[PDB]
PDB file of C-alpha atoms in Angstrom:
ATOM      1  CA  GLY A   1     -49.415 -98.431 118.513  1.00 43.94           C
ATOM      2  CA  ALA A   2     -50.861 -99.498 115.176  1.00 44.01           C
ATOM      3  CA  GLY A   3     -52.317 -96.001 114.727  1.00 43.44           C
ATOM      4  CA  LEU A   4     -55.212 -97.205 112.577  1.00 42.56           C
ATOM      5  CA  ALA A   5     -57.981 -95.104 114.115  1.00 44.53           C
ATOM      6  CA  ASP A   6     -55.656 -92.113 114.102  1.00 44.48           C
ATOM      7  CA  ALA A   7     -54.934 -92.582 110.389  1.00 43.85           C
ATOM      8  CA  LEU A   8     -58.677 -92.251 109.818  1.00 44.72           C
ATOM      9  CA  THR A   9     -59.457 -89.403 112.253  1.00 45.81           C
ATOM     10  CA  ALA A  10     -56.541 -87.387 113.528  1.00 47.70           C
ATOM     11  CA  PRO A  11     -54.462 -84.667 111.835  1.00 49.66           C
ATOM     12  CA  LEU A  12     -50.844 -85.361 111.037  1.00 51.60           C
ATOM     13  CA  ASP A  13     -48.206 -83.774 113.255  1.00 51.25           C
ATOM     14  CA  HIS A  14     -44.428 -83.566 113.307  1.00 48.56           C
ATOM     15  CA  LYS A  15     -44.016 -86.840 115.202  1.00 51.06           C
ATOM     16  CA  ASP A  16     -45.719 -88.949 112.528  1.00 51.25           C
ATOM     17  CA  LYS A  17     -43.159 -90.883 110.533  1.00 51.28           C
ATOM     18  CA  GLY A  18     -43.087 -90.603 106.747  1.00 53.98           C
ATOM     19  CA  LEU A  19     -44.544 -91.601 104.365  1.00 55.34           C
ATOM     20  CA  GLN A  20     -47.069 -88.953 105.497  1.00 53.70           C
ATOM     21  CA  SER A  21     -49.909 -89.625 103.098  1.00 53.33           C
ATOM     22  CA  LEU A  22     -50.891 -91.112  99.774  1.00 53.22           C
ATOM     23  CA  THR A  23     -53.534 -90.386  97.193  1.00 54.59           C
ATOM     24  CA  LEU A  24     -56.164 -93.071  96.649  1.00 54.02           C
ATOM     25  CA  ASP A  25     -56.342 -93.340  92.885  1.00 53.81           C
ATOM     26  CA  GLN A  26     -56.146 -96.979  91.834  1.00 50.85           C
ATOM     27  CA  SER A  27     -57.707 -98.118  95.104  1.00 52.17           C
ATOM     28  CA  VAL A  28     -61.096 -96.578  94.278  1.00 52.70           C
ATOM     29  CA  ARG A  29     -62.619 -95.728  90.905  1.00 51.84           C
ATOM     30  CA  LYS A  30     -63.648 -92.208  90.052  1.00 50.00           C
ATOM     31  CA  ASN A  31     -67.307 -92.717  90.831  1.00 47.17           C
ATOM     32  CA  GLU A  32     -66.947 -94.993  93.844  1.00 43.24           C
ATOM     33  CA  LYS A  33     -66.249 -94.625  97.536  1.00 46.56           C
ATOM     34  CA  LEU A  34     -64.131 -96.678  99.889  1.00 45.04           C
ATOM     35  CA  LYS A  35     -65.277 -96.706 103.529  1.00 45.43           C
ATOM     36  CA  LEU A  36     -62.338 -97.738 105.731  1.00 48.55           C
ATOM     37  CA  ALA A  37     -62.882 -98.830 109.317  1.00 51.52           C
ATOM     38  CA  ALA A  38     -60.532 -99.824 112.095  1.00 51.72           C
ATOM     39  CA  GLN A  39     -60.258 -99.559 115.862  1.00 51.45           C
ATOM     40  CA  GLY A  40     -63.697 -98.027 116.192  1.00 51.12           C
ATOM     41  CA  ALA A  41     -63.162 -95.255 113.629  1.00 49.09           C
ATOM     42  CA  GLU A  42     -64.323 -94.929 110.034  1.00 49.24           C
ATOM     43  CA  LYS A  43     -63.703 -92.602 107.123  1.00 46.36           C
ATOM     44  CA  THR A  44     -65.129 -92.501 103.605  1.00 47.76           C
ATOM     45  CA  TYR A  45     -62.674 -91.852 100.779  1.00 46.63           C
ATOM     46  CA  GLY A  46     -63.201 -90.972  97.143  1.00 46.00           C
ATOM     47  CA  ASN A  47     -60.839 -91.107  94.228  1.00 46.96           C
ATOM     48  CA  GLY A  48     -58.048 -88.597  94.732  1.00 48.04           C
ATOM     49  CA  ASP A  49     -58.505 -88.292  98.504  1.00 46.22           C
ATOM     50  CA  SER A  50     -55.518 -88.553 100.841  1.00 47.35           C
ATOM     51  CA  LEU A  51     -54.984 -91.388 103.327  1.00 47.86           C
ATOM     52  CA  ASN A  52     -52.788 -90.349 106.274  1.00 45.51           C
ATOM     53  CA  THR A  53     -50.320 -93.224 106.346  1.00 44.66           C
ATOM     54  CA  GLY A  54     -48.008 -91.219 108.613  1.00 43.50           C
ATOM     55  CA  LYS A  55     -49.977 -92.611 111.568  1.00 43.60           C
ATOM     56  CA  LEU A  56     -49.240 -96.241 110.620  1.00 45.02           C
ATOM     57  CA  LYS A  57     -46.266 -98.445 111.482  1.00 46.57           C
ATOM     58  CA  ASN A  58     -43.402 -98.615 109.013  1.00 47.05           C
ATOM     59  CA  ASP A  59     -42.261-101.793 107.270  1.00 48.87           C
ATOM     60  CA  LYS A  60     -45.363-103.821 108.029  1.00 46.31           C
ATOM     61  CA  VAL A  61     -48.893-104.334 106.799  1.00 44.69           C
ATOM     62  CA  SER A  62     -51.668-102.303 108.426  1.00 45.41           C
ATOM     63  CA  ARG A  63     -55.182-103.691 108.075  1.00 44.16           C
ATOM     64  CA  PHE A  64     -58.581-102.021 107.858  1.00 41.55           C
ATOM     65  CA  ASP A  65     -62.030-103.239 106.952  1.00 41.29           C
ATOM     66  CA  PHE A  66     -63.403-101.803 103.707  1.00 40.58           C
ATOM     67  CA  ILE A  67     -66.769-101.383 102.065  1.00 40.26           C
ATOM     68  CA  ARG A  68     -66.749-100.259  98.417  1.00 41.42           C
ATOM     69  CA  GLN A  69     -69.841 -98.303  97.377  1.00 40.15           C
ATOM     70  CA  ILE A  70     -71.416 -96.570  94.420  1.00 41.22           C
ATOM     71  CA  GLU A  71     -74.578 -94.519  94.024  1.00 40.00           C
ATOM     72  CA  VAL A  72     -77.497 -95.820  91.980  1.00 38.17           C
ATOM     73  CA  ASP A  73     -79.968 -93.078  91.211  1.00 35.01           C
ATOM     74  CA  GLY A  74     -78.287 -90.996  93.911  1.00 34.98           C
ATOM     75  CA  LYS A  75     -78.511 -93.611  96.684  1.00 33.34           C
ATOM     76  CA  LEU A  76     -75.537 -95.580  98.027  1.00 34.44           C
ATOM     77  CA  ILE A  77     -75.240 -99.333  97.589  1.00 33.71           C
ATOM     78  CA  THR A  78     -72.476-101.730  98.591  1.00 32.69           C
ATOM     79  CA  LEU A  79     -70.564-103.539  95.848  1.00 37.05           C
ATOM     80  CA  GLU A  80     -67.839-105.338  97.799  1.00 35.87           C
ATOM     81  CA  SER A  81     -66.329-105.704 101.246  1.00 37.71           C
ATOM     82  CA  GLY A  82     -63.154-107.097 102.728  1.00 36.78           C
ATOM     83  CA  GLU A  83     -59.804-106.089 104.166  1.00 36.06           C
ATOM     84  CA  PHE A  84     -57.777-103.087 103.006  1.00 38.55           C
ATOM     85  CA  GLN A  85     -54.022-103.409 103.501  1.00 37.83           C
ATOM     86  CA  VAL A  86     -51.320-100.747 103.584  1.00 37.36           C
ATOM     87  CA  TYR A  87     -47.604-101.489 103.468  1.00 40.14           C
ATOM     88  CA  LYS A  88     -45.756 -98.336 104.524  1.00 39.93           C
ATOM     89  CA  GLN A  89     -42.159 -97.283 103.941  1.00 39.01           C
ATOM     90  CA  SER A  90     -40.500 -93.890 104.544  1.00 37.44           C
ATOM     91  CA  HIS A  91     -40.942 -92.480 101.030  1.00 37.32           C
ATOM     92  CA  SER A  92     -43.365 -94.976  99.486  1.00 38.25           C
ATOM     93  CA  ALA A  93     -46.350 -97.155 100.280  1.00 37.54           C
ATOM     94  CA  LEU A  94     -48.630 -99.729  98.711  1.00 37.08           C
ATOM     95  CA  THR A  95     -52.294-100.516  99.200  1.00 32.85           C
ATOM     96  CA  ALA A  96     -54.104-103.785  98.523  1.00 35.25           C
ATOM     97  CA  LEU A  97     -57.679-105.053  98.711  1.00 37.75           C
ATOM     98  CA  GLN A  98     -58.547-108.537  99.941  1.00 38.28           C
ATOM     99  CA  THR A  99     -62.118-109.114  98.843  1.00 39.67           C
ATOM    100  CA  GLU A 100     -64.280-111.233 101.094  1.00 37.55           C
ATOM    101  CA  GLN A 101     -67.830-110.478  99.885  1.00 36.54           C
ATOM    102  CA  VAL A 102     -69.272-109.225  96.573  1.00 34.21           C
ATOM    103  CA  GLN A 103     -72.585-108.526  94.938  1.00 33.91           C
ATOM    104  CA  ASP A 104     -74.033-111.697  93.451  1.00 32.32           C
ATOM    105  CA  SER A 105     -74.666-112.518  89.798  1.00 29.78           C
ATOM    106  CA  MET A 106     -73.713-110.667  98.888  1.00 31.81           C
ATOM    107  CA  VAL A 107     -71.671-113.831  98.332  1.00 30.77           C
ATOM    108  CA  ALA A 108     -68.256-114.913  99.513  1.00 32.30           C
ATOM    109  CA  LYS A 109     -65.651-114.522  96.828  1.00 30.86           C
ATOM    110  CA  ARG A 110     -62.039-114.115  97.845  1.00 32.87           C
ATOM    111  CA  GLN A 111     -59.670-112.234  95.584  1.00 33.39           C
ATOM    112  CA  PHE A 112     -56.710-109.982  96.122  1.00 32.32           C
ATOM    113  CA  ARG A 113     -55.468-106.978  94.174  1.00 35.06           C
ATOM    114  CA  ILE A 114     -52.862-104.290  94.561  1.00 36.64           C
ATOM    115  CA  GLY A 115     -54.318-100.797  94.672  1.00 34.78           C
ATOM    116  CA  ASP A 116     -52.028 -97.813  94.789  1.00 33.93           C
ATOM    117  CA  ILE A 117     -48.277 -97.630  94.302  1.00 35.45           C
ATOM    118  CA  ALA A 118     -47.571 -94.296  95.965  1.00 34.00           C
ATOM    119  CA  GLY A 119     -44.941 -92.012  97.355  1.00 35.16           C
ATOM    120  CA  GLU A 120     -42.260 -89.398  96.763  1.00 37.91           C
ATOM    121  CA  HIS A 121     -41.225 -90.561  93.325  1.00 38.75           C
ATOM    122  CA  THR A 122     -37.596 -90.262  92.244  1.00 37.91           C
ATOM    123  CA  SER A 123     -37.241 -88.060  89.195  1.00 33.18           C
ATOM    124  CA  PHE A 124     -35.591 -89.855  86.299  1.00 30.10           C
ATOM    125  CA  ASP A 125     -33.003 -87.086  85.906  1.00 31.99           C
ATOM    126  CA  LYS A 126     -32.079 -87.304  89.594  1.00 31.82           C
ATOM    127  CA  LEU A 127     -31.188 -90.992  89.314  1.00 30.13           C
ATOM    128  CA  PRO A 128     -27.578 -91.910  90.118  1.00 29.96           C
ATOM    129  CA  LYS A 129     -25.674 -91.753  86.852  1.00 27.50           C
ATOM    130  CA  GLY A 130     -23.708 -94.925  87.611  1.00 24.93           C
ATOM    131  CA  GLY A 131     -23.077 -97.698  90.071  1.00 24.61           C
ATOM    132  CA  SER A 132     -25.652-100.127  91.349  1.00 24.52           C
ATOM    133  CA  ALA A 133     -27.943-100.416  94.319  1.00 24.44           C
ATOM    134  CA  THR A 134     -29.457-103.477  95.951  1.00 22.76           C
ATOM    135  CA  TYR A 135     -32.800-103.353  97.696  1.00 21.58           C
ATOM    136  CA  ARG A 136     -34.349-105.681 100.241  1.00 20.66           C
ATOM    137  CA  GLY A 137     -37.878-105.755 101.565  1.00 23.70           C
ATOM    138  CA  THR A 138     -41.228-107.476 101.605  1.00 28.10           C
ATOM    139  CA  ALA A 139     -43.407-109.344  99.161  1.00 26.64           C
ATOM    140  CA  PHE A 140     -47.022-109.849 100.198  1.00 25.57           C
ATOM    141  CA  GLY A 141     -49.975-111.571  98.589  1.00 29.43           C
ATOM    142  CA  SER A 142     -53.342-112.905  99.693  1.00 30.49           C
ATOM    143  CA  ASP A 143     -53.066-114.236 103.245  1.00 29.93           C
ATOM    144  CA  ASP A 144     -49.246-114.016 103.203  1.00 29.09           C
ATOM    145  CA  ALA A 145     -47.141-111.016 104.219  1.00 28.17           C
ATOM    146  CA  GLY A 146     -44.030-113.123 104.804  1.00 27.16           C
ATOM    147  CA  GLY A 147     -42.342-112.922 101.428  1.00 29.32           C
ATOM    148  CA  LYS A 148     -39.007-111.318 100.691  1.00 31.73           C
ATOM    149  CA  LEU A 149     -38.036-109.003  97.859  1.00 32.17           C
ATOM    150  CA  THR A 150     -34.499-108.671  96.586  1.00 32.72           C
ATOM    151  CA  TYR A 151     -33.822-106.355  93.680  1.00 34.11           C
ATOM    152  CA  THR A 152     -30.761-104.768  92.082  1.00 30.79           C
ATOM    153  CA  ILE A 153     -30.643-101.715  89.820  1.00 31.96           C
ATOM    154  CA  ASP A 154     -27.636-101.029  87.604  1.00 30.67           C
ATOM    155  CA  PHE A 155     -27.909 -97.268  87.101  1.00 31.02           C
ATOM    156  CA  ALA A 156     -25.216 -97.217  84.411  1.00 30.09           C
ATOM    157  CA  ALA A 157     -27.015 -99.853  82.333  1.00 32.85           C
ATOM    158  CA  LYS A 158     -30.493 -98.557  83.298  1.00 34.19           C
ATOM    159  CA  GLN A 159     -31.599-102.095  84.083  1.00 34.84           C
ATOM    160  CA  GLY A 160     -32.949-103.868  87.099  1.00 35.86           C
ATOM    161  CA  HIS A 161     -33.669-107.436  88.111  1.00 36.43           C
ATOM    162  CA  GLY A 162     -34.486-109.398  91.225  1.00 36.80           C
ATOM    163  CA  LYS A 163     -36.579-112.088  92.821  1.00 39.36           C
ATOM    164  CA  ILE A 164     -39.348-112.925  95.244  1.00 40.04           C
ATOM    165  CA  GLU A 165     -38.675-115.573  97.894  1.00 40.58           C
ATOM    166  CA  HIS A 166     -40.351-117.211 100.855  1.00 38.26           C
ATOM    167  CA  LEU A 167     -44.006-116.837  99.907  1.00 38.11           C
ATOM    168  CA  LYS A 168     -45.884-119.927 101.049  1.00 37.06           C
ATOM    169  CA  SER A 169     -47.303-120.673  97.605  1.00 35.16           C
ATOM    170  CA  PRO A 170     -44.087-121.830  95.874  1.00 33.62           C
ATOM    171  CA  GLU A 171     -45.030-120.729  92.341  1.00 35.95           C
ATOM    172  CA  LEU A 172     -45.134-117.130  93.573  1.00 36.74           C
ATOM    173  CA  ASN A 173     -41.365-117.125  94.253  1.00 33.90           C
ATOM    174  CA  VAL A 174     -40.585-115.792  90.798  1.00 36.05           C
ATOM    175  CA  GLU A 175     -37.753-114.053  89.048  1.00 35.88           C
ATOM    176  CA  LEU A 176     -38.301-110.343  88.387  1.00 38.28           C
ATOM    177  CA  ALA A 177     -36.587-110.544  85.037  1.00 35.86           C
ATOM    178  CA  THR A 178     -34.184-107.945  83.721  1.00 36.01           C
ATOM    179  CA  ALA A 179     -36.008-104.843  82.565  1.00 35.97           C
ATOM    180  CA  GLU A 180     -35.327-101.272  81.559  1.00 33.36           C
ATOM    181  CA  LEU A 181     -35.242 -98.343  83.960  1.00 34.55           C
ATOM    182  CA  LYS A 182     -37.159 -95.590  82.177  1.00 36.12           C
ATOM    183  CA  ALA A 183     -39.083 -92.390  82.740  1.00 33.06           C
ATOM    184  CA  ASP A 184     -42.873 -92.541  83.142  1.00 33.16           C
ATOM    185  CA  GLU A 185     -45.421 -89.912  82.087  1.00 34.29           C
ATOM    186  CA  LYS A 186     -44.404 -87.753  85.119  1.00 36.34           C
ATOM    187  CA  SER A 187     -40.638 -88.120  84.460  1.00 37.56           C
ATOM    188  CA  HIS A 188     -40.477 -90.479  87.426  1.00 37.00           C
ATOM    189  CA  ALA A 189     -38.218 -93.508  87.375  1.00 35.41           C
ATOM    190  CA  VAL A 190     -40.005 -96.841  86.764  1.00 36.04           C
ATOM    191  CA  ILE A 191     -39.269-100.421  85.681  1.00 34.99           C
ATOM    192  CA  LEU A 192     -41.843-102.549  83.856  1.00 34.01           C
ATOM    193  CA  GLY A 193     -40.819-106.161  83.305  1.00 34.05           C
ATOM    194  CA  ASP A 194     -41.862-109.789  83.210  1.00 32.13           C
ATOM    195  CA  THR A 195     -42.184-112.242  86.042  1.00 30.04           C
ATOM    196  CA  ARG A 196     -40.601-115.556  85.125  1.00 31.87           C
ATOM    197  CA  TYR A 197     -40.338-119.026  86.594  1.00 29.14           C
ATOM    198  CA  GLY A 198     -37.820-121.250  84.937  1.00 29.73           C
ATOM    199  CA  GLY A 199     -37.375-118.533  82.304  1.00 32.56           C
ATOM    200  CA  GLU A 200     -41.040-118.752  81.194  1.00 32.27           C
ATOM    201  CA  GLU A 201     -43.204-115.670  81.599  1.00 32.51           C
ATOM    202  CA  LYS A 202     -45.854-115.861  84.313  1.00 35.17           C
ATOM    203  CA  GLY A 203     -46.992-112.243  84.414  1.00 36.43           C
ATOM    204  CA  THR A 204     -45.510-108.781  84.743  1.00 38.04           C
ATOM    205  CA  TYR A 205     -44.136-106.481  87.400  1.00 39.49           C
ATOM    206  CA  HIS A 206     -44.138-102.722  87.878  1.00 44.54           C
ATOM    207  CA  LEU A 207     -41.612-101.059  90.196  1.00 47.08           C
ATOM    208  CA  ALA A 208     -41.282 -97.359  90.892  1.00 47.17           C
ATOM    209  CA  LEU A 209     -38.297 -95.697  92.565  1.00 50.45           C
ATOM    210  CA  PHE A 210     -38.854 -93.406  95.537  1.00 51.72           C
ATOM    211  CA  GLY A 211     -36.849 -90.910  97.555  1.00 49.11           C
ATOM    212  CA  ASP A 212     -34.577 -88.125  96.398  1.00 52.87           C
ATOM    213  CA  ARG A 213     -31.995 -90.690  95.219  1.00 52.58           C
ATOM    214  CA  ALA A 214     -33.951 -93.892  94.746  1.00 50.67           C
ATOM    215  CA  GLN A 215     -33.569 -95.039  98.353  1.00 50.89           C
ATOM    216  CA  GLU A 216     -36.753 -97.118  98.027  1.00 51.93           C
ATOM    217  CA  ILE A 217     -38.668 -99.178  95.495  1.00 54.47           C
ATOM    218  CA  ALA A 218     -42.316-100.209  95.545  1.00 58.10           C
ATOM    219  CA  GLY A 219     -44.741-101.821  93.136  1.00 56.67           C
ATOM    220  CA  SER A 220     -46.547-104.968  92.173  1.00 55.54           C
ATOM    221  CA  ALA A 221     -46.094-108.277  90.412  1.00 54.96           C
ATOM    222  CA  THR A 222     -48.452-110.866  88.955  1.00 56.12           C
ATOM    223  CA  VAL A 223     -48.039-114.618  88.690  1.00 54.40           C
ATOM    224  CA  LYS A 224     -50.585-116.804  86.888  1.00 53.32           C
ATOM    225  CA  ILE A 225     -51.226-120.318  88.235  1.00 51.83           C
ATOM    226  CA  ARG A 226     -53.461-122.202  85.802  1.00 55.76           C
ATOM    227  CA  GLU A 227     -55.768-119.367  84.779  1.00 54.23           C
ATOM    228  CA  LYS A 228     -55.701-117.555  88.134  1.00 52.59           C
ATOM    229  CA  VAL A 229     -53.645-114.381  88.450  1.00 52.62           C
ATOM    230  CA  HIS A 230     -52.062-113.837  91.876  1.00 53.08           C
ATOM    231  CA  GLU A 231     -51.120-110.256  92.601  1.00 52.63           C
ATOM    232  CA  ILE A 232     -48.181-109.499  94.892  1.00 51.61           C
ATOM    233  CA  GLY A 233     -47.131-106.249  96.520  1.00 51.09           C
ATOM    234  CA  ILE A 234     -43.377-105.677  96.544  1.00 49.37           C
ATOM    235  CA  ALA A 235     -41.507-102.944  98.391  1.00 49.85           C
ATOM    236  CA  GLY A 236     -37.997-102.502  99.663  1.00 47.13           C
ATOM    237  CA  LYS A 237     -35.189-100.221 100.735  1.00 44.10           C
ATOM    238  CA  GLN A 238     -31.583 -99.809  99.648  1.00 47.15           C
ATOM    239  CA  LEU A 239     -28.969-101.780 101.579  1.00 47.59           C
TER     240      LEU A 239
END
């Protein structure tokens, strides 16, 4: 049961697997709305509203249709439409938007972006004080949810590194170069680094740690091919 209509319509209950919900912040700007539709249901979301991911399947991509709207002189118009993707783990989740149509100057333009990086963030002070952990999971980009993430954090050194493999576009199978594990503005544990291919920078990556002891990681990476930036969602779980 993909649980897509239920995510949009039905209250959470004790049988719904975590992650229970996420806040739509990066997925929709402060003055816009995101109308999500699937399986005959629809719900309109604004910035800061909760999406009940508990209804969705874990460790895979769930897909909805979206329409992104704004008001002009108090009346709604459509800016963009496409597919809204959610990749759900137990303490973390990612969203992404695959554009299919946009306002002209509606025309077909295809682009893909990561929206929210969400979950039960690990507090920096609650990180393991030593040892290392290795994580495995998924990398997904436009039209391709088959990639693999591998990532290792050395808690003693406060450094992480890893790689993306198996995406169909070969340039996307980048190194997630060594980067510092630091505290963000909420005292949550994060890693901001460079993507590299043959040691040359191709973009950046952002990983956040989730769970009471950093059981999960989730975030995004970018890889530029000619002038075109390809965004990739990356999420995994400790081995």
